[PDB]
Amino acid sequence: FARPCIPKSFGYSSVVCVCNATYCDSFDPPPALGTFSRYESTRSGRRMELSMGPIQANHTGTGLLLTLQPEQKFQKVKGFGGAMTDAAALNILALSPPAQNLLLKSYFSEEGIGYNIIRVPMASCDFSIRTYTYADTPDDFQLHNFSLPEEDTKLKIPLIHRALQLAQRPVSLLASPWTSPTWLKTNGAVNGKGSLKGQPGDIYHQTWARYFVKFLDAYAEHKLQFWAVTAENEPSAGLLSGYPFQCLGFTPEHQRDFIARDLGPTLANSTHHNVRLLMLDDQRLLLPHWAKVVLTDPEAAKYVHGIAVHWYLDFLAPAKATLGETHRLFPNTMLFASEACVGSKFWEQSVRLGSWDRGMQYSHSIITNLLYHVVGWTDWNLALNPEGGPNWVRNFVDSPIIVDITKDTFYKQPMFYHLGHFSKFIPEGSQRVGLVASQKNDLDAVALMHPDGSAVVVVLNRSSKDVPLTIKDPAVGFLETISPGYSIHTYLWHRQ
Numbered sequence: 001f002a003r004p005c006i007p008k009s010f011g012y013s014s015v016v017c018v019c020n021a022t023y024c025d026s027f028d029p030p031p032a033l034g035t036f037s038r039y040e041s042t043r044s045g046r047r048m049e050l051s052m053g054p055i056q057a058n059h060t061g062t063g064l065l066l067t068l069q070p071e072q073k074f075q076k077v078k079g080f081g082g083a084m085t086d087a088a089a090l091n092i093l094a095l096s097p098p099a100q101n102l103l104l105k106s107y108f109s110e111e112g113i114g115y116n117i118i119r120v121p122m123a124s125c126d127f128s129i130r131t132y133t134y135a136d137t138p139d140d141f142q143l144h145n146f147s148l149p150e151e152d153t154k155l156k157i158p159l160i161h162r163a164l165q166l167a168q169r170p171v172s173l174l175a176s177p178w179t180s181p182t183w184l185k186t187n188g189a190v191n192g193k194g195s196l197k198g199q200p201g202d203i204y205h206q207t208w209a210r211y212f213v214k215f216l217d218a219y220a221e222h223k224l225q226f227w228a229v230t231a232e233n234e235p236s237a238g239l240l241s242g243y244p245f246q247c248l249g250f251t252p253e254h255q256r257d258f259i260a261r262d263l264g265p266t267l268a269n270s271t272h273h274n275v276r277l278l279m280l281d282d283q284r285l286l287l288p289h290w291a292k293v294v295l296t297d298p299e300a301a302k303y304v305h306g307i308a309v310h311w312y313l314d315f316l317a318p319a320k321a322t323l324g325e326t327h328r329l330f331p332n333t334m335l336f337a338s339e340a341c342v343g344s345k346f347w348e349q350s351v352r353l354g355s356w357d358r359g360m361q362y363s364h365s366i367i368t369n370l371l372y373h374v375v376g377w378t379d380w381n382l383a384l385n386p387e388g389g390p391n392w393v394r395n396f397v398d399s400p401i402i403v404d405i406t407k408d409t410f411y412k413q414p415m416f417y418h419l420g421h422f423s424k425f426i427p428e429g430s431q432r433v434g435l436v437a438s439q440k441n442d443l444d445a446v447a448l449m450h451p452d453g454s455a456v457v458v459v460l461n462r463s464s465k466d467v468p469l470t471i472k473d474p475a476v477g478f479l480e481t482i483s484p485g486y487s488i489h490t491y492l493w494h495r496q
Ligand SMILES: *[C@@H]1O[C@H](CO)[C@@H](O[C@@H]2O[C@H](CO)[C@@H](O[C@@H]3O[C@H](CO)[C@@H](O)[C@H](O)[C@@H]3O)[C@H](O)[C@H]2NC(C)=O)[C@H](O[C@@H]2O[C@@H](C)[C@@H](O)[C@@H](O)[C@@H]2O)[C@H]1NC(C)=O
Pocket: 006, 019, 020, 021, 022, 023
């Protein structure tokens, strides 16, 4: 059953949708040839609302025309999701159980927005309320005392199981570490400037690499398998003197030799050889330099399935020079966006309930990434409190869902819908295809083909001006529509 959004304003540019123990917005059950479906969200308050129109055989005029080039084939989509941090888990479980179910449904269900990716930190990050690794007992090179604590066994793992039961789509898990045990590090601390002791290939590096296998073991004992792991979350962090929360620094040469000598072989000789390894997990300005240092060494290249990027310094990194150039040089190594949130700059408010601007940053990043070959996009924390935490160093940020414990209430923000416009309608295996514009325009738009050959187009209007437009699909026809200011649309049609 479709239930509209209950809107509530907090004085920002748009509303949130209010959900509680007994009510949350949702969709009806799921067109017909020669018609299209349109989903629309607007700053004014529409939330993924469904309409239909006809596909017309002819068209005339000089308005903006967008033309699919379905024979121009690019990358296949892996998918979309968010991260189950310690904070996300504590926030979700702070709700009554029926409200928890509706929050999980909103993300993971086909009646929600159909996430198919969850990122899971290996032990503690800044979005944790205590500092721990899985092997804190000093000098345990054999990892006999490797253990998952309750943050995993009572919080994260049972929530991930419930997300899997809700999903119809297969859901892929991605793991990333922030720090190693402090006794493997040069500075003997979870934060600050410091890297693994010694050099790739030695006892410290072989132990760190075994720690990934032990992690995959412990999770598999709890019946969870991984699609992929990253070699390190933001390895450049640990090069930065005073870095305030968990990290572990690698130069690109250091990452190359660690993956070639320790991490690659250790994974390939385990029962977990099918888990993919992703490198970088860092700002895209490190591209294409890091891809060059690592992937021109055939011993590291043979283990690296892809490159993960974070969005935070995007303003210093035009997409063509980083993503584009990387795909040109290394087209067989997939690009994947592994982490993004807004609110993290020192001078921004962490949480702005109902910010349409923040919603637009999500979809503009997602469309730009798809336009430059990226196969998937993962948000950061799945839910936060109204402060943007908790977070042991107060590195508060915003989230698509904000949980208010004392009201047994949660708020879906514009970000939630800007993401849904893609995750709901672009299943795994969808393939990005060509789309060209007849004149300069202010729209961001991308076109993909579903596995069954039907079409999906996302149109984001970041300007205040209504742009009437047409979408041309060769040998099915023409969709006449309009892209209102501050809107996002998703169009779907069978080519059948
Ligand atoms: C969880 O959230 C849901 C949906 O928002 C709450 O349900 C609803 O409560 C509204 C206000 O309390 C209801 O509204 C009114 O009706 C009359 C006219 O018929 C108006 O004059 C009036 O000003 C309101 O608009 C609304 O009908 C109802 N919405 C739906 C679709 O169910 C729910 O609230 C709780 O249960 C309901 C049935 C009432 O008894 C409420 O008092 C009560 O808060 C929310 N649950 C909680 C704990 O807040």
